[PDB]
Amino acid sequence: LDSLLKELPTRTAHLYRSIWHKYTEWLKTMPDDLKLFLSQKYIVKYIASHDDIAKDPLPTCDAMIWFSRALDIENNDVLVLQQRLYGLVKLLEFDYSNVIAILQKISINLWNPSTDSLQSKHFKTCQDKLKLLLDFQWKFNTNVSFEDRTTVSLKDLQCILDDENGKCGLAHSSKPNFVLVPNFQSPFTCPIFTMAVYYYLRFHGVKKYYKGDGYQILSQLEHIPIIRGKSLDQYPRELTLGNWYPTIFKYCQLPYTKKHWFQVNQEWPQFPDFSESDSENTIGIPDFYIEKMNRTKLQPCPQVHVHLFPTDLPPDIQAVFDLLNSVLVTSLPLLYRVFPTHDIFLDPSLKTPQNIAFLTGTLPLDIESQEHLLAQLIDKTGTVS
């Protein structure tokens, strides 16, 4: 023990004791006994307050490890903690949105209802484009394994609506651990808006064009996959998506590496693992994780008076679908002003005197905002701006 404490340099050790003092005082800020002191929760709270220590957190984390092995702690505990901590230093040591114009450059093109340069078999509909796009936007935001992507049953999903702290999103506390949040600043690059449109198409369908699946099967079925393949109850197969992907990267002219989207990407940030929210955390997770990985500030769910989704459902899924409703209905007038040719607008429902009324009303944000985004697609539509 004490020899292990002796093993180190001296400036570093003086620093370590000074930080022990600092953290003890910042814990005395709160009412509350050594893992509670050196707690992942309390440590990340300290770091959220002490962004200054996030500038040199290398000896911070190494000292936390050194104390987590100083006293009588099971060595497996400190090293799984160390895995979490290496995840944290990877998360925080990079502070810019570099993996991003690939997002933008894609999302837009996959929203665009008319893709002429695309002679490829798949992607005939807007539902194929949206299916892929949701899978992509999803990996990009949550950084999750594909296999795990297919493991998640949407009945597992949990809507987060907290208007006390102004938060909303879709959470999963089960095997893959993640939290999705609406980007109202950039609806197109928002995975939830994506999921809302795709889900309208999937479920309601478009009258006289594409059969909805019906909202009835959300009971009779045991596992509802986030995106459906041929069969109602299953996620699309791996090689299938594997085909869909290069196809789009090609047309977008971005280089494609399968390992990036089908497996966890380590140069990339990840959620921790943990074996309904509050002020500073959501499911198990500190909020800065969520705002950073979803790259948007946390905002309360906007209240809409129009219902595109059903107001009659099992209580479990309802909350989810209301969230989807608010995002969809919030951002739809924009989609209409950009891609009025989109399949969604072909429904007679959206053709009513009112729904036309609100699609043509005030804009969710001014047009001049999304210019740059639009500049990124390789087929200019009938509307050029």
Partner: protein, 387 residues
């Protein structure tokens, strides 16, 4: 008083300051073992605490900042310790003989260079001064000086010193120290190894860790990393050497340094185990200095102790007078020559108190009659004999 003290010769002031080694500040940090003890000594003190220095110099000071009022103490200390004529003669005289007392090197803070004067053990800072102030106090020249790498001074600061002694100035510096940054990494080596070309006043090096040593120095770990190791032209230009701070040097190790040629003096301190039978060396280096360590394992000298008779042994010393006994005379010289050939590239061996040596001392009389073999009272050995 002052001028009464300054009307005096130099030996007096020298011994006085030797008793006042380096305590110029009114404070002191502890060692490492005294850290975990929560006892803090006392420093309740107050203002005249400018926010021009506590903010600037914190890279070597703000590490601590966790005790009774220390930084205002430190701040006013740095203030008043710019006018101690006491200190000016302290430095004129300590420089005159030897600055084994103050470790004195370059620094840059705020992009502004200065010359800092620290302790030796780990170089806790005491004060610093400007070059023009320094050589208005003294004579300006290419006055050879020291340098070491910290997490404070690593790469760009280090490359700033490089490019400053290129552009503004010339490389007035010799000696290099590796006091922290044991990883061979985080930009220290990356900075320094391309930077030892304008760096031609030196012979002297200081090393810390067995990791850094084994992965930089001990030449059995051969690789082909060109920028990770030295250029061999500097390996010629290193007549001196120093190293500290490790546990198990030679236990089944690869101890051999034939590449480390044109060396002429070795220094070792602060360790916990050593054996000399694994040790291999170049020529040209006989000055060996060795400081407080744990029990040492001398050379074997066992067979050679079995060669011996009590025909001649007296008082721990021996000789054949009988020219007629070439049998015994040639044997004597064979014995003596084997003895020196064990120590072959060595003529001077210094020990501070290491508390034990285990390995059957039998030495020559030519050198112990003089002060070559210079042991402190690490007097836990008995198997002594001389030739």
């Amino acid at each position: 008083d002052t001028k009464l003290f300054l009307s005096l010769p130099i030996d007096i002031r020298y011994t006085v300051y030797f008793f006042l080694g380096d305590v110029v500040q009114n404070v002191r940090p502890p060692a490492k073992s005294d850290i975990f003890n929560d006892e803090l000594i006392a420093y309740p003190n107050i203002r005249e605490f400018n926010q021009s220095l506590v903010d600037k110099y914190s890279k070597h000071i703000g590490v601590y900042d966790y005790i009774p009022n220390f930084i205002p103490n430190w701040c006013r200390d740095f203030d008043l310790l710019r006018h101690d004529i006491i200190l000016t003669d302290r430095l004129r005289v300590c420089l005159q003989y030897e600055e084994q007392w103050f470790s004195v090197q370059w620094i840059v803070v705020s992009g502004e260079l200065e010359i800092g004067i620290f302790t030796t053990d780990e170089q806790f800072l005491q004060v610093s001064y400007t070059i023009n102030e320094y050589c208005h106090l003294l004579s300006i020249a290419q006055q050879d000086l020291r340098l070491g790498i910290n997490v404070s001074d690593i790469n760009d600061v280090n490359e700033l010193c490089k490019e400053i002694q290129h552009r503004w100035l010339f490389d007035t510096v010799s000696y290099i120290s590796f006091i922290n940054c044991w990883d061979l990494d985080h930009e220290n080596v990356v900075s320094i190894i391309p930077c030892m070309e304008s760096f031609n006043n030196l012979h002297m090096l200081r090393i810390e860790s067995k990791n850094m040593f084994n992965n930089l120095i001990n030449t059995q770990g051969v690789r082909e990393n060109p920028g990770k190791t030295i250029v061999y032209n500097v390996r010629q230009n290193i007549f001196e050497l120093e190293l500290y701070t490790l546990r198990d040097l030679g236990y089944k190790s690869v101890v051999d340094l034939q590449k480390w040629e044109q060396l002429q003096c070795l220094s070792l301190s602060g360790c916990e185990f050593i054996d000399l039978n694994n040790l291999i060396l170049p020529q040209h280096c006989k000055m060996l200095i060795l400081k407080e360590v744990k029990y040492i394992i001398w050379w074997d000298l066992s067979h050679l102790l079995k060669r011996i008779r009590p025909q001649w042994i007296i008082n721990g010393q021996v000789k054949k007078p009988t020219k007629k006994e070439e049998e015994e005379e040639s044997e004597w010289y064979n014995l003596y020559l084997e003895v020196v050939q064990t120590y072959q590239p060595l003529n001077f061996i210094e020990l501070h108190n290491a508390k034990r040596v285990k390995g059957n001392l039998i030495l020559p009389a030519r050198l112990v009659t003089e002060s070559r073999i210079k042991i402190s009272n690490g007097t836990k050995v008995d198997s002594v004999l001389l030739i």
